[PDB]
Design a protein around this ligand. Structure first.
Ligand code: NI
Length: 341
């Protein structure tokens, strides 16, 4: 059944709750972003109101074929009324079109649902600064102190410098980047920019990117693989067998592959710095795992929460085990006692 952490009390609303059939008593279904664990269940047969950002609504229409009459896009940073309740959508610093949602309940309670987010100090100067938030529905993906990672900026600098050096040493090297969802577009776009190439990809992936309102996108991507020396492939194909295979396909235009796998966290983060990352190499193929995250580190999450000072926290991630739930509740109490709320 629909879990309690997907329901907004005092409303007829649900958040990211599309795989339970008709939720009894739901008058409006919000969708925070276009990732499959969140939209799971939506299709052209859906006939209830879906509230979301403009970009998420472009992806619902073009990729899932949801009918336009049930898509209700809202602008960001704007007080809107939905079924009689004031809501605001805020940028979540996750993937394109990802939002946090502020609900102003008739009884005076204010609720923030983060969806998926990467907390950032810039959020402390949004509309969130203007009133007290009582309850926080929190993306707790990396809520444990082992989870450190560098800034997105540091990681993109590494990737750009690595690619540029490799291709300038060998003009017949191909760069490949893995993907299995929207997000992390900076990785492949930043690399293609430094090399003066467009990024080449499948017709399905190009269609997905043309939904994202990225400025000048027609100048940066293409379905012509032959003209491009940065290719995007399914994350599944980013291994030696898949890459050897791909290289055969290019007809001896290239003699070397440099590949990037933008992972979330991986246990080399506890020991090794970004400056010290190395690839796995077999023959003329090298694969780099780079820790490009679109979720809060532990310290970023802690700073946001200690700033916000909520009265109650409801985790939305890692909720399936008693050991995880208990560990998270221990950190929440530490944070509250340290900061004095
Ligand atoms: Ni997500």
């Amino acid at each position: 059944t629909c879990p309690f952490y997907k329901k907004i009390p005092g409303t007829g609303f649900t958040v990211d709750a599309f795989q339970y059939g008709v939720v009894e008593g739901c008058t409006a279904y919000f969708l925070t972003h276009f990732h499959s664990d969140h939209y799971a269940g939506l299709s052209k047969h859906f006939t209830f109101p879906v509230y979301c950002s403009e970009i998420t609504g472009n992806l619902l229409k073009n990729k899932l074929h949801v009918q336009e009459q049930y898509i209700h896009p809202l602008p960001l940073d704007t007080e809107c009324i939905v079924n009689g309740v004031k809501v605001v959508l805020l940028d979540a610093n996750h993937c394109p079109g990802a939002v946090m949602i502020l609900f102003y309940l008739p009884n005076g309670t204010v609720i923030l649902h983060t969806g998926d987010f990467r907390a950032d100090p810039s959020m402390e100067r949004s509309l969130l600064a203007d009133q007290k938030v009582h309850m926080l529905y929190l993306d707790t993906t990396y809520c444990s102190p082992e989870y450190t990672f560098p800034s997105q900026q540091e990681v993109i600098r590494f990737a750009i410098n690595t690619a540029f050096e490799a291709v300038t040493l060998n003009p017949h090297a191909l760069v490949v980047c893995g993907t299995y969802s929207i997000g992390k577009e900076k990785v492949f776009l930043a690399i293609a920019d430094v090399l003066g190439s467009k990024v080449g990809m499948s017709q399905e992936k190009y269609k997905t990117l043309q939904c994202l309102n990225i400025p000048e996108i027609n100048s940066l991507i293409t379905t012509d693989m032959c003209s491009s020396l940065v290719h995007l492939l399914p994350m599944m194909q980013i291994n030696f067998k898949g890459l050897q295979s791909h290289l055969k396909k290019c007809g001896g235009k290239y003699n070397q592959i440099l590949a990037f796998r933008p992972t979330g966290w991986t246990h080399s983060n506890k020991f090794t710095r970004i400056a010290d990352v190395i690839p796995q190499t077999k023959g003329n193929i090298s694969i780099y795992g780079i820790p490009y995250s679109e979720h809060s580190s532990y310290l970023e999450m802690k700073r946001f929460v200690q700033w916000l000072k909520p009265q109650k926290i409801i985790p939305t991630v890692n909720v399936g085990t008693w050991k995880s739930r208990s560990t998270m509740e221990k950190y929440f109490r530490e944070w509250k006692l340290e900061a004095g709320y």
